[PDB]
Amino acid sequence: NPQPVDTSNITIPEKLEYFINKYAEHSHDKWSMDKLANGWIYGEIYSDSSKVQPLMKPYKLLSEKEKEIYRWPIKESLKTMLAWGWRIERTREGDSMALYNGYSPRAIDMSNVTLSRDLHAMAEMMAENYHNIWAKKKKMELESKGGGNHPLLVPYDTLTAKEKAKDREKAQDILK
Amino acid sequence: RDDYDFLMQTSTYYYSVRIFPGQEPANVWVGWIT
Amino acid sequence: PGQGRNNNGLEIGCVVDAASGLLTFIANGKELSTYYQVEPSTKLFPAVFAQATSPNVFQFELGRIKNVMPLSAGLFKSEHKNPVPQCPPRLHVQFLS
């Protein structure tokens, strides 16, 4: 049965707002390098064939009407960890980092950073909950259509490594 | 532009160590030993 | 500052003055406060102690900076006056075992 662990009722803490903004910046930056590699160029006018698009600008120059597409999934992710009761805290080193506080974007290669075994199990659980979220949405769409049962609607254990890889690396990068 | 005369008369040597991203620098020490 | 490694790999620079025995360290282009003074005729081995938190740990760079000689000249007598950095096959990484 596909269900997400419901987390709409709880609310976000104020301390995590800086982390949300910073991870939104990083996600936007990775988005930017992806389309710079693809050949997309910056420009106010938007054309698909010309690969011109106004949002390869710096995150501060980004308007608010576009910023929600990054903050939103982050908000539901952090709400998912809070719903399970995972106590999230901040070290004094993190507060020191906040004290420290044309456009060539550049991200952090997180692959070299490694998590512990407990954090790996944590990421596996949050990945299972993501696959349940996507499975519930896909099953609602699938009952709306009425046919063509999707092959990946099978349980997360039945899912293989490659199919689980994208969600697993999403959990990995957020924990990193 | 390095001064060639200084480079020839100097006895000062240098090596550098690059800690790759993802490796905690608090776990890394750099220097000389006997 | 922090985040000195994630954007670009952190770069410790070790400077040794064989004529005076003064040991100075520069990190990311700024000179660190820690310094050492050794006795004459001291033999100093470049050393890195690291606990692995990543598949790639560190790199031994054998370059040179402004007004400073590369390590190869001080190591090898034949290259004493050769400003081009070198890594001859004799130089290799050893570990405590």
UniProtKB/Swiss-Prot annotation, chain B:
Disulfide bonds: none annotated. Detected in heart muscle (at protein level). Heart muscle, brain (cerebellum and hippocampus) and placenta. Induction: By TGFB1. It comes from the Eukaryota. It is found in: Sarcoplasmic reticulum membrane. Channel activity is modulated by phosphorylation. Phosphorylation is increased in failing heart, leading to calcium leaks and increased cytoplasmic Ca(2+) levels. It is linked to Ventricular tachycardia, catecholaminergic polymorphic, 1, with or without atrial dysfunction and/or dilated cardiomyopathy: An arrhythmogenic disorder characterized by stress-induced, bidirectional ventricular tachycardia that may degenerate into cardiac arrest and cause sudden death. Patients present with recurrent syncope, seizures, or sudden death after physical activity or emotional stress. CPVT1 inheritance is autosomal dominant. Ventricular arrhythmias due to cardiac ryanodine receptor calcium release deficiency syndrome: An autosomal dominant arrhythmogenic disorder characterized by syncope, cardiac arrest and/or sudden unexpected death, often in association with physical exertion or acute emotional stress. Patients who survive manifest polymorphic ventricular tachycardia and ventricular fibrillation. Unlike typical catecholaminergic ventricular tachycardia, arrhythmias are not reproducible on exercise stress testing or adrenaline challenge. Belongs to the ryanodine receptor (TC 1.A.3.1) family. RYR2 subfamily. Cytosolic calcium-activated calcium channel that mediates the release of Ca(2+) from the sarcoplasmic reticulum into the cytosol and thereby plays a key role in triggering cardiac muscle contraction. Aberrant channel activation can lead to cardiac arrhythmia. In cardiac myocytes, calcium release is triggered by increased Ca(2+) cytosolic levels due to activation of the L-type calcium channel CACNA1C. The calcium channel activity is modulated by formation of heterotetramers with RYR3. Required for cellular calcium ion homeostasis. Required for embryonic heart development. The calcium release channel activity resides in the C-terminal region while the remaining part of the protein resides in the cytoplasm. Homotetramer. Can also form heterotetramers with RYR1 and RYR3. Interacts with FKBP1A and FKBP1B; these interactions may stabilize the channel in its closed state and prevent Ca(2+) leaks. Interacts with CALM and S100A1; these interactions regulate channel activity. Identified in a complex composed of RYR2, FKBP1B, PKA catalytic subunit, PRKAR2A, AKAP6, and the protein phosphatases PP2A and PP1. Interacts directly with FKBP1B, PKA, PP1 and PP2A. Interacts with SELENON. In cardiac muscles, identified in a complex, composed of FSD2, CMYA5 and RYR2. This is Ryanodine receptor 2. The chain holds residues 1414 to 1447 of 4967 of the full protein.
